[PDB]
Design a protein around this ligand. Structure first.
Ligand SMILES: O=C1NC[C@H](I)C(=O)N1
Ligand code: SF4
Lengths: 1012, 1019
């Protein structure tokens, strides 16, 4: 027989690139290396002076954009800090900790809800906020080598997913009905300008219940600068439209073609028409001009940022204007005057118009550029040239068009004063000139319409910085027009701030007062109306999430705070009779080593050698009475433990019952410590003992009680059944897994107690034991149908919680997830579960896995271009191949240059918790019930691949050597020797890059040698 | 009574900053926000035009420097790619995949060994390589939002730890003894210039066995440009000294004060003195000059990069020159001409000398700067000004001092040609001028000493690009002198490339030939001599690592490659008699969800519903015969399974024994599939059945055999004991844990088989089950002392392997770690175990935890300054506090400058084992002494948490865990965000467990009387 233990020529060939440790140092001349380097190049070449062509290319260029894979990693990395400095550094005070936590838990709805609650333009800001100067600038992770969290990108991702869900906004469900609202709320309100500031202000007013809000916009388009000037390649117009419609869901009206101006709309005309309040958010409508450009027109090649950017926007933003205008024909050398952030958008936009070269010329130095670094970077990588210390003086015109610009050198002296030497003239060539000197409010017709409000020295309407109120009580202003805000988020905040005092003003005009403490409503949608209550063993839970008997329930004061946060129920730490009082050792709770040396947020497990509660039964019983008195709707379950003694169990259970506990939990599963005292596992591993203890309790009390089972047994069903036979109303599955978390290199354990550095087997908790808990819950559910199960073991999100519900559990206990964070996670779990149930009724989102959209082919989270000349060309994203892709993409843009949002409606009833419990059991069975004829094979999407070769290595040393890994393109190809083991898909770093599909060829197992 | 379920005022107060979900939108005016922002500011202010004072500040400014915490995260993130593009993009071809894998496995020694094997200046390069234009430029992770891997920083970290280990280099232990080396190896070899190129060349020649190698260096210092010009704030001189000493460990000699010149050393004098070969690595010793600077001196304020940088270096690098060197007094405006990478080091160095302002003036545009971006950024963040399109023409001097420089405008025409308008003159003020136009070789006395080698039109010695050989057969050249290399790493490669052909040349001169395939030796140290063999049940294992019976052993051809890679032993996939032939389903192996939505490298677990081998017993038995025939020293264990039938077990075991297997493994633990056919989990949970099966096998065969136990039982010791009573020679602990990995939101499972999307309980493997496996191994070891244990369950490194050895196991089976990577991990496991055993004999490194140094107070991996005026000042690293810290640090630098206290020497000495290196047999079971009952633990030796404020990153996680999961014992300052553990601490240890900074929080003995809180008094 051939040499069986040896690879034939063909396999040896397929394994050519499989890693093998070298026995000697490598030998490759410096010349050979220089010639080989360019083939694998991924990033920009520092020696390349050009860059691809960007004409008519408006694809997203943001470095912060994230796909799901990337967002999940970055969200998990976030420390989710207390009193977070990032939130303090956010103009709209977004609870960054909460929304990022929701993202890491895959609860995109909850994340978006939190974002929009404080920022009505959440998506826009996620995309355009100059974070390095705001939230990200204060991020604690800046103190790590990996750096600060990409907050903007994460905000953008959650908001994008929400937008894709097509869920509308609704008024707070707690507000009185429309007709029951006081008369004051029907007061006519007017807002001028449809920009971030007015959109924000009108949104909050609408949240408060005002039913007659109207925004008067001068232009035919809405959104202000977010629409008219911010480039499409930074902020898609589609985003603006999304946020505008969300506002309209609250009844806000918008009327375009209406301007604030003398003989148009004025404060007087509004007052005479009955309007009770007005908000001014018209921004700075005019370009800051300069003498030297007088008479210059566009025909000659001159523009101000106010002239240029809107032209590019109208041409590149579909939906902005009814008319499809041409892209400004910019050819030759372009000069952008100024170093502000607007100048850089002019420079980058110029390139899209066909500019051959773009020069940014400013009167100060490089160090004086005050534009956000991230913005400056975009212009720099697109090869814009920078010319410092030059002040414009003349725009030389010859032939009816600009041919150059004359400058004069500038310089700083000692005192730090700037001088411009008039003798040193500079001649710069240029076919087009764009001034980006800023914007202002000059139009006398407009200023006049604001009479008689007071203006300050800046020639801008004066307002109280806290109330946003002008000299005229009923008139407020905010945004660019006030001159303080420098960003979209600050403008949104101005409108937000104003909304509260406009509310206060209006209510007072009707003789009504408002709360002393500001109460702007949060953001709501129909998802928030979803009922997640559940009944079990005769008990009613407002939600299925509760605190397990553990460290988070060390004290009853903590349970009170958990209930105040919103937890449906809670277990007391396990307590006992005075004679069984315990004393803990220290250290006793350590982090898991189950997922490597990863510290901080999201520990994959914990190990503890803690005993039951150190507090007395008297303390616990009095505490339960207090808790039930103050929180009658929150379920309190008393966890108790006794040795194998009938009188003790009856005494303690009755004492607990008399205190008012809704139910009891019998701790028959402590994996350490209590066992030596004749309790815990010893009693919980023997069906007979479990049965008798339950009988003793059943006979002692009338309230329901549940037996908490240990997973450390051969057959957990036998003890679950014993509990049922004994009279238990259900079982809690499960307690911690017995284990040893590890040793230091010197052999000592952790935890290590005392000078002797001793330890004992502890209990493992967390996500690392979830597979064990899920198996336990499902086996019990299948064996004892209908028998109440309280799940516990690795529940850290609505998503994982739903898994246990589907597995047969009715309620969900949590410990480790709280130890990893805090009690506020309940907000995430509830909004998350509501969203998951809501989405099950949306027919158009059935291709989604929970809150996750179906993964689309992408690279760096950005969708891959669907150009015919690119598909199936084996062009990886590196080296000469990358160069070809760019050439094809640019070509496509030139070719293209040559050529309604509706909410989804539930088409079926939203399921209730009772409708989903146990629905997964139908898929579970024996191995024999699985089909061995319906085989699958792996198929790789070459467009999503990042060429790492992990699929290849896993199949080579852990599989069937079925993958070909190209030595030039580093692209893998699954051949037909694939057996569908699925390991390659399991190790792939790109989510859904590899998928398992039905095998079309006949499957035949490899026997190595024929059978007889 | 008081309301027990309520927090008293004091606690409510301590909980002030504890997170609580808001019921309404927040309200904070834009003005209020603007005023609050600066208090929490971490990064540079885009509105601030001046960077803190840097006079005499030579602290590390590299953004790529990593501490252990950061290195482990970045190493774990690396994809560890096949045929890695980063390696292809590295001039020395470092096996980046391997060394980063070693780092993620905490095997810093193995990482360093791999690095130095291909690059003798591994640490230097890690710190200075312009990676964006090299290795990192080709990193696949560039295609992800998080970006490319910080390869240089990881290389630097591993190399730094190795440096701290103070382990010397030794010649390959396989080379013949010195006296038995052929005469050819005693040939006198000479190298000119002690720079990267010569150091590399001499190192490899020494590795090959040459015993008479001498480097002649012109200056009194060694290291070349790494020493004389690269700033101390980018490359500490002691890094250079470290690498020089490693080279000297191989006998290489260095003689300073000897120059290659017409007056001293020439090719002719060397030839007449008997030298058989020479390597020229003198670089480009002279500055590129320009007529307009004729006559200008330092006194007036003029310097070339060649004049300036060496002065700053001699003054800031302790150990470079023994004499005292005054820091160049540079005050006023400084002009650096040029935009090359040297210009930027001149600019940043000028600031350290006292420059008030530094301007970089270049004749082309910003887009034309060809210096690596990372270098440009350093100058930019330190506020250096940039002036483009300006070409120097005249230097104005008054009072014997420079006062200005005259330039002329430049620009490109439509043809791409550069022009300089002579009419547009520019007057720029300046007190100091530094030209950084490059370097060259012009000295006729030096060029003459190279006669008669041929020079090319670049006026540089001509060499064959592949052999590095000049027109004179015995003379080779490399590095800057050749004009191709632009980096330290390329210069190192030039010397590396030349060493092989110099070797070939010399051998040929003695009538000997060399292998057709280049065989430059790897890097070796005494650690490599450590014996990691072990004996168990009469079997001899060359190393304790082996492949578990699993996917990695699906085919015997895979086992062959694993043995070729170096694995000590391997198990065949479990096989059975023909009548019990199985057929797998698909999908059947999925990634674990045990550590969240983290994909790619290092999955924390896998779940499988795979059955035993689909290949026949005939295939397996023939395969074992073949494997044992070709690898007699590698242990092969045949895994077999039968239903509860005596004849079957005896038939199969005998068939396996006859094939030549060293031993057998009885699979009595498959947690799924086989149970239905009456095997695996069925028979392995009952002590009686286990005992009988072992008895049947014991009487059927004579070779040793082990029972593979399942962890899915109440008492694993009962099964293990049953196996021992049945005659088993040992047990394998353990097989996979029974579980369900999860469901999709629609309720369907994964894996899901068929259109019905069905599944069944599978087996969990990987690090997620290690706690269960460790417990199993320790409990069996304590109950049955001396009984052989083969460990399996989450072993993915030498470190984790050592934990199982310490727990009682003799050998280590691996599966998931290979599924997560490949067979080469064996190299990491072996070097790692050798290092861990070696370190146990080094007395001066007892404060280390294995290969991990004790954690020093740091921020971003950089040691915190020990200035008195900073300690205990509650100055966090943000906002106005950060401003204060910088002010204090700058003052300290000025204070240290006034001292002119000639820097202390530098004597590097190797640590010597002061006790025998333990063998595997000496560590087995050594951890059992610390294990016991809960009652054996002391409840009087309590501890409390103590936080090092200097390492804290102010996240408040310790605060939040103690609040909602602890005892509300931590105060979190609302202004500094600094936590303080109070006396109410109970030492639960949760805060330390969730802290993101390794060792920021430590548990220390409680000094106050500990008293449990009862809530209510006892009666
Ligand atoms: O995890 C496993 N799968 C297949 C049968 C075994 O022994 N173990
Ligand atoms: S050891 Fe425990 S009681 Fe002490 S400050 Fe840390 S979480 Fe709180």
């Amino acid at each position: 027989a051939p040499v069986l233990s040896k690879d034939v020529a063909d396999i040896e060939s397929i394994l050519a690139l499989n890693p093998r440790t070298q026995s000697h140092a490598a030998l490759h001349s410096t010349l050979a290396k220089k010639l080989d380097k360019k083939h694998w190049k991924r990033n920009p070449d520092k020696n390349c002076f050009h860059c691809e062509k960007l004409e008519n290319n408006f694809d997203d260029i943001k470095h912060t954009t994230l796909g799901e894979r990337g967002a999940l990693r970055e969200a998990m990395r976030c420390l989710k800090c207390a009193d977070a400095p990032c939130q303090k550094s956010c103009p709209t005070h977004l609870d960054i900790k909460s929304f990022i936590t929701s993202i890491s838990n895959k609860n995109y709805y909850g994340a978006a809800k939190m974002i929009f609650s404080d920022n009505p333009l959440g998506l826009t800001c996620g995309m355009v906020c100059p974070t390095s100067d705001l939230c990200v600038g204060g991020c604690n992770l800046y103190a790590t080598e990996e750096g600060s969290i990409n907050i903007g990108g994460l905000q953008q991702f959650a908001s994008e997913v929400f937008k894709a869900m097509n869920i509308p906004q609704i008024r707070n469900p707690c507000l009185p009905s429309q007709e029951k609202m006081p008369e004051a709320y029907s007061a006519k309100i007017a807002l001028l300008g449809a920009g971030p500031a007015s959109i924000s202000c009108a949104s909050f007013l609408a949240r408060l219940g005002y039913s007659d809000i109207t925004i008067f916009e001068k232009q035919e388009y809405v959104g202000g600068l977010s629409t008219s000037e911010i480039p499409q390649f930074r902020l898609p117009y589609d985003v603006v439209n999304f946020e505008i419609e969300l506002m309209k869901d609250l009844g806000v009206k918008i009327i375009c073609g209406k301007s604030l101006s003398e003989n148009e709309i004025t404060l007087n005309t509004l007052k005479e028409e009955g309007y009770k309040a007005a908000f001014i958010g018209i921004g700075l409508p005019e370009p800051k001009t300069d003498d030297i450009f007088q008479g210059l027109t566009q025909d000659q090649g001159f523009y101000t940022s106010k002239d240029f950017l809107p032209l590019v926007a109208k041409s590149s933003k579909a939906g902005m204007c009814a008319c499809h205008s041409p892209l400004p024909s910019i050819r030759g050398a372009v000069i952008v005057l100024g170093a502000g952030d607007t100048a850089f958008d002019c420079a980058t936009s110029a390139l899209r118009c066909g500019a051959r070269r773009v020069f940014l010329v400013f009167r100060k130095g490089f160090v004086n550029i005050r534009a956000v670094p991230e913005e400056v970077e975009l212009a720099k990588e697109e090869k814009c040239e920078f010319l410092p210390f030059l002040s414009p003086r003349k725009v030389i015109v010859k032939g009816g068009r600009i041919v150059a610009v004359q400058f004069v050198r500038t310089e700083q002296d000692e005192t730090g004063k700037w001088n411009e030497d008039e003798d040193q003239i500079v001649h710069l060539k240029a076919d087009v000139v764009i001034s980006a000197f800023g914007s202002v409010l000059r139009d006398p017709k407009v200023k006049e319409a604001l009479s008689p409000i007071k203006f300050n020295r800046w020639d801008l309407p004066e307002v109280d910085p806290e109330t946003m109120q002008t000299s005229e009580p009923w008139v407020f202003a905010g945004g660019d027009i006030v001159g303080m805000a420098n960003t979209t988020v600050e403008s949104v905040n101005d409108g937000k701030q104003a909304s509260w005092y406009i509310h206060k003003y209006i209510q007072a005009q009707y003789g009504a007062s408002v709360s002393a403490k500001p109460e702007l409503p949060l953001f709501y949608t129909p998802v928030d109306l979803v009922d997640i209550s559940v009944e079990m063993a005769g008990l009613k839970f407002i939600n299925p999430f509760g605190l397990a008997s553990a460290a988070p329930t060390t004290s009853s004061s903590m349970i009170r705070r958990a209930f105040e946060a919103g937890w449906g129920f809670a277990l007391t730490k396990t307590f006992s009779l005075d004679k069984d009082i315990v004393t803990n050792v220290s250290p006793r709770i350590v982090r898991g080593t189950t997922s490597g040396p990863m510290y901080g947020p999201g520990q994959s497990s914990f190990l503890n050698i803690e005993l039951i509660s150190e507090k007395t039964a008297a303390y616990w019983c009095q505490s339960v009475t207090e808790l039930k008195a103050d929180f009658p709707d929150n379920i309190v379950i008393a966890s108790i433990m006794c040795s194998y003694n009938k009188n003790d169990w009856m005494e303690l259970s009755r004492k607990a019952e008399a205190s008012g506990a809704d139910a009891l939990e019998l701790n028959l599963s402590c994996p350490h410590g209590m066992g030596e005292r004749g309790m815990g596992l010893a009693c919980g591993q023997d069906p007979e003992l479990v049965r008798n203890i339950c009988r003793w309790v059943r006979q002692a009390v009338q309230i329901p009680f549940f037996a908490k089972l240990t997973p450390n047994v051969t057959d957990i069903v036998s003890i679950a059944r014993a509990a049922k036979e004994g009279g238990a109303d259900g079982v809690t599955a499960t307690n911690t897994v017995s284990g040893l978390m590890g040793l230091k290199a010197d052999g000592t354990p952790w935890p290590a107690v005392g000078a002797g550095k001793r330890t004992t087997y502890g209990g493992v908790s967390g996500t690392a034991i979830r597979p064990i808990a899920l198996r336990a819950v499902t086996t019990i559910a299948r064996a004892l149908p209908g028998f109440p199960i309280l799940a516990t073991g690795g529940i850290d999100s609505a998503e994982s919680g739903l898994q246990f519900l589907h597995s047969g559990a009715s309620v969900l206990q949590v410990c480790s997830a709280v130890q990893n964070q805090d009690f506020t996670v309940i907000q995430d779990y509830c909004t998350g579960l509501k969203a998951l149930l809501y989405l099950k009724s949306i027919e158009e989102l059935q291709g989604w896995d929970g809150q996750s959209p179906g993964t689309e082919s992408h690279q760096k989270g950005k969708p891959v271009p669907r150009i015919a000349e690119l598909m199936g060309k084996k062009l990886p994203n590196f080296g000469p191949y990358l160069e070809q892709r760019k050439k094809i993409i640019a070509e496509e843009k030139m070719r293209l240059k040559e050529q309604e949002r509706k909410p989804f409606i539930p088409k079926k009833p939203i399921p209730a918790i009772k409708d989903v419990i146990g629905k997964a059991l139908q898929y579970l069975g024996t191995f024999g019930e699985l089909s061995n004829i319906e085989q699958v094979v792996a198929v790789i999407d070459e467009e999503m691949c990042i060429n790492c070769g992990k699929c290849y290595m896993t199949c080579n040393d852990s599989g069937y050597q079925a993958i070909q890994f190209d030595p030039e393109t580093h692209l893998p190809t699954v051949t037909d020797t694939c057996t569908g083991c699925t390991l390659c898909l399991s190790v792939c770093p790109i989510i859904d890059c590899i998928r398992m599909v039905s095998r079309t060829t006949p499957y035949e197992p490899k026997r190595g040698l024929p059978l007889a």
